[PDB]
Ligand binder design. Structure first.
Ligand SMILES: O=c1[nH]c(=O)n([C@H]2C[C@H](O)[C@@H](CO)O2)cc1/C=C/Br
Ligand SMILES: O=c1[nH]c(=O)n([C@H]2C[C@H](O)[C@@H](CO)O2)cc1/C=C/Br
Lengths: 304, 309
């Protein structure tokens, strides 16, 4: 069976992810952000909706709970194209290519399902607009990590990123620096959690508070009072959700892209990170054509 | 190599599903209750009361269509949470199908299945106007992979006996809405058909234009018919590719399930016995370790203790 190489460009927004990633593509397909689904298809102006709710809450115009139903609902719309894409792609993915020949196909996904199912929801809770239980519901629904999941997260100084973000302002966005901090922190903890997990870290054994300290992983976010029994013990439901987060993240292949550089530079770098990524076999002869079409139809229909 | 028997009893509420689940376990077996405590306090405060109140305000016209959808969707996420985590932890303990084959080492009787929270109630709420079809399809896209030996028992009870039954008991927060009752009844009815249609070779794509335990049903009698929504249709008339991909998943998820029908129009013990009879010819699965049984047993035990009653 021929091999496929899937790469998921992810990280905080405003770092130049999309720009540099189309820049290297345009055997290689680029799956963009489902902007059309966000703005029109699934609902109208989801982005605007998200940034507006926060602001009304920020300004005391709504309660933390109103911001939460809207926020939760919006996050459902946000990752819908990602959930179906993973779901349909899942059967075609086989085991890792002996890592391997040039892959018969390279998919450049602009973000992975975890952004909408884990990262953004976490950021919003850190922003006071999502319940830690809603977040934990998103985690529980995270699809099993298919082999060959290479996530490229980005690295960029804060003030440089604020400069860059001043422009990557999706339709109806608000330059919220606290959200930028929250999301940077969330993607930071995540890079740390993957390592902690890959280095043998056990959240249940470390809960009591080489490899990162549990206090520097996503597990810290869930020491939320809402998640605890009157005796301080995490409820089992929530603990089982942390077990899921743990097995979904431990098999993901993480790579870092320093965005503090020129477009051709960021782009070159990304082409560099490619040599250590895990590729896989497709399950059928028709997998490559069918995957290629999938990717081209997503772009065509939802890219904006 | 031990074998496990999983049985999810599902269907519209108010049919007596839980008494009969419990009676059956009173006759080894382990019962996994509805996570009423998660819905009342752990995940959110009075989630069921919220659902019935939100639809009401929508109905009364106090809240607006989208105001309700935003509440219904968040309420549906909370309702399904315990179901989705329990499924995710179970998954790696489930091995190949064995059949019903000798007595299983462990028998798990679940009150409802993940699709109740991620498909049925949401599809029912869509029909009630309190949810959008895009969102229902969003949930559908997140329906976890169907593990082998996924035996689902749906109930059958006459519309009238059901209404009376509903009319007698009292859920906390629930409100007698026979419009939702009919909605939930039709939805579980399309589900039953859907499984059979898929198991009879149907391809919703082949038959989209047309919109065993019996013959193959007409696509219009399956759940695919709820998605002929204008908002899911492109200008050219067909469904946008996102939504059609969601329906492919729905097909994949339900075609490997083993669905059974239990008639609830009999005494509690009658139902107890009718279900004990369907159970005999239900597909078992091996576990992935002898020690998966103890584990599985305890997971079920803790779930009950923590979220039941
Ligand atoms: O879950 C999400 N939620 C969210 O708030 N965003 C924001 C970031 C930026 O404002 C704009 C474009 O990424 O939308 C992205 C996603 C991505 C999901 Br895949
Ligand atoms: O998704 C759901 N949503 C919903 O409205 N309910 C209602 C039914 C009844 O009124 C009450 C108890 O099941 O809650 C059940 C479920 C259970 C899903 Br698992």
């Amino acid at each position: 069976m021929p091999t496929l190489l899937r790469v998921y460009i992810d990280g905080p927004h405003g770092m130049g992810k999309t720009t540099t990633t189309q820049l290297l593509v345009a055997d290689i397909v680029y799956v963009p952000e489902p902007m059309t689904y966000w703005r029109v298809l699934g609902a109208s102006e989801t982005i605007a909706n998200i940034y507006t709710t926060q602001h009304r809450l920020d300004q005391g115009e709504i309660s933390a709970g109103d911001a939460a139903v809207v926020m939760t609902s919006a996050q459902i719309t946000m990752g819908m194209p990602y959930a179906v894409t993973d779901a349909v792609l899942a059967p075609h993915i086989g085991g890792e290519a002996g890592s391997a020949p040039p892959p018969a196909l390279t998919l450049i996904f602009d973000r992975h399902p975890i952004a909408a199912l884990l990262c953004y929801p976490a950021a919003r809770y850190l922003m006071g607009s999502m319940t830690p239980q809603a977040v934990l519901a998103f985690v529980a629904l995270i699809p099993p990590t298919l082999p060959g999941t290479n996530i490229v997260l980005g690295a960029l100084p804060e003030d440089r990123h604020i400069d860059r973000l001043a422009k990557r302002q999706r339709p109806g966005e608000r330059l919220d620096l606290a959200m930028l901090a929250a999301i940077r922190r969330v993607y930071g903890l995540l890079a740390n959690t993957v390592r902690y997990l890959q280095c043998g870290g056990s959240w249940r054994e470390d809960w009591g508070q080489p490899r990162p300290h549990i206090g520097d992983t996503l597990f810290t976010l869930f020491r939320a009072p809402e998640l605890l029994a009157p005796n301080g013990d995490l409820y089992n439901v929530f603990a089982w959700a942390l077990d899921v987060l743990a097995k979904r993240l431990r098999s993901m292949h993480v790579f870092i892209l320093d965005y503090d550089q020129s477009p051709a530079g960021c782009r070159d770098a990304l082409l560099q990170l490619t040599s250590g990524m895990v590729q896989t076999h497709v399950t059928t002869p028709g997998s490559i054509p069918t995957i290629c079409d999938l990717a081209r139809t997503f772009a065509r229909e939802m890219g904006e």
